[PDB]
Amino acid sequence: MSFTNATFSQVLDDLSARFILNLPAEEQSSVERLCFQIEQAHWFYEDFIRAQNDQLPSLGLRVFSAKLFAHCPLLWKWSKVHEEAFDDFLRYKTRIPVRGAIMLDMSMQQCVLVKGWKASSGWGFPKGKIDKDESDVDCAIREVYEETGFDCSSRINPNEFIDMTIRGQNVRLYIIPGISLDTRFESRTRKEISKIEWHNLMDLPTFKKNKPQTMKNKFYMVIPFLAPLKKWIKKRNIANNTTKEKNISVDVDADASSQLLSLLKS
Template sequence: MGVIRGPSLAPVAGSSATASTSKSAATSSAASTAQSTYNDAAYAYASLTFQEVLEDLSSRFIVNLPAEELSSIERICFQVEQAHWFYEDFLRPINPSLPSQGLRRFSGSLLQASAQTVPLIQQYTSGGALDAVFDDFMRYKTRVPVCGIVLLNTTWDKASCLLVKGWKSSSAWGFPKGKINQSESERDCAVREMLEETGFNCDELLPGNSAEYMELTMREQRIRLYIVPGIEEETRFETLTRKEISKIAWFKLSDLPTWKKQKEPAAGLGGKFYLISPFV
């Protein structure tokens, strides 16, 4: 990718260099303020008990949602999942005394903490049905459409595509993709997931009405992958996520598995391929 050049910082004729100095000082001050705010927040969380953290997360992620969101237990559960990521990725490193919890156990804890304020949740906590709510949510998630992008290089005689590997050592390699958000188009979901997982913004490379995609349905879940060719392999990729993507790499199409021929990633890359052969 070419270097993006900004406007010149040379003083305009008749102006004073003091403006540049003031801007620099303001920027430094803003950065200092932001760091101070983060430090204050980190200090506050470092002294909270688990129950106090649950009450804070309940307020941040659930209680103050719009009324239409609070009328759907599925939408509430998506917020619980977001809160769980925030808890494990940000709060526990700040406060190591907080217990690590899987999504099921954490969901029960946070929903219990939110039940006093959200009438819909009370219906499930009073009947002891939180486990059933979690199981239904996990089944619901598997039916949410998934969108992503197959990024291709510029060399057709050595055609390659970009794959990402999950965070755990046992995670598989797959195309950048993820579940579509409410009211989000398939195309926008694909662009967002590519940006989040690889740091690459292909918004200008993928037309809003693009018909260049592959699509299939597996176990009631629709998967759509858009094709974006012509990307230089020297392009720098860096995930914007935390503890979700561990590696990003180019793979030759000839090295990928197909329905007729199964293959594994090269030694040293770890993991296996996931949902590759249906699209190759």
């Protein structure tokens, strides 16, 4: 809980000193070699730091990276042509795709999470890599089934999901509301999993405005999707009393992200 009282600025310096600041000059000049470390930082931020300081804003990679440059002097010597090519590269870096789901109850205040054994494994949403020629929706259906025992092919909605680049992967979690609250979960094809449980969203580290996190739970790439989720639900609730779902998706590295970049960068 080192970063509970750090300002945003102090957090930015740390992440810099930690990941990019002290790299060999050549690695700072390598879009790839630098993009990798920045991808690590952005994840360290969303996954560890925001967890002890919810005041800190949830950022898409592209925005987080811009603010990480402000705390990295060795990057200040470089062209607009250069910094734009980098951001380009952040936008389109060939990354391994990962698909899965955020399973919610009917009332949208509880979600399904999966835990390995190991004490070094934190809870996480069901998700995995893509098998050859397999489709995004089809990969999600499969991962959920393998990890959870629950077949979601009848409720999964190809139009409803959250996209986000985190720790060098392109994560897409389909959002499937209305999962039976006494579904029985199984993991017989996935011997690594020890627990699969409903958690209250309000107990998740950054979910409620000023609830501090108890040191009794570890979460993997959960925290980063919580901002886009709150947004998803807000919108899906508007849709519920106006029309009919379908449209509702949230892409973290898209417009929301370029709007904020323009505000910083102008």
